[PDB]
């Protein structure tokens, strides 16, 4: 749920 | 308080509505699942009720550069975009007011912290374009 891109 | 030319404007609250869920049939990317996600935009009236955001004749979602053709244009409320991906990201939503009254860049964050979540943003809108002013009357005082 906290996955984020760069 | 407003100053100078910004006195001749009204504030309206926009609500950005985001939903997302995992797509199991898509292979995870580096063990991260791929999710389908959607963003829509509505306008709130003086009482807080959602109404179609007809004060915009165009919305452009400026997606993270990992998306193909990442600038996605929509012309009809609620300007719903649907995409798939594996990571959240900040994204600017350009909303274009009627009668060339102006672009507003609304900062959004697309994330997977909830299955669905809503964020409100206040924008300032000029009162010098007759068709826009008439449209603005639907959502409150002008």
Numbering used by the authors:
A (entry chain B): 5 to 10
B (entry chain A): -4 to 137
Sentences copied from the publication:
In contrast, when complexed with H3K9cr, W81 adopted two conformations, with r1 and r2 providing maximum π stacking with the crotonyl amide and the crotonyl alkene moiety, respectively. Neither the complex with propionylated H3K9pr peptide nor the complex with acetylated H3K9ac peptide had the r2 conformation of W81, indicating that it is a unique feature available to the unsaturated acyl modification but not to saturated acyllysine modifications.
Canonical acyllysine readers, bromodomain and double PHD finger (DPF), display comparable binding capabilities toward various short acyl chain modifications, and while the YEATS domain exhibits preference for crotonyllysine, it still associates albeit more weakly with other acyllysine marks. In this study, we elucidate the significance of π stacking components in targeting of acetyllysines by the YEATS domains and report a previously uncharacterized DNA-binding activity of the human AF9-YEATS domain.
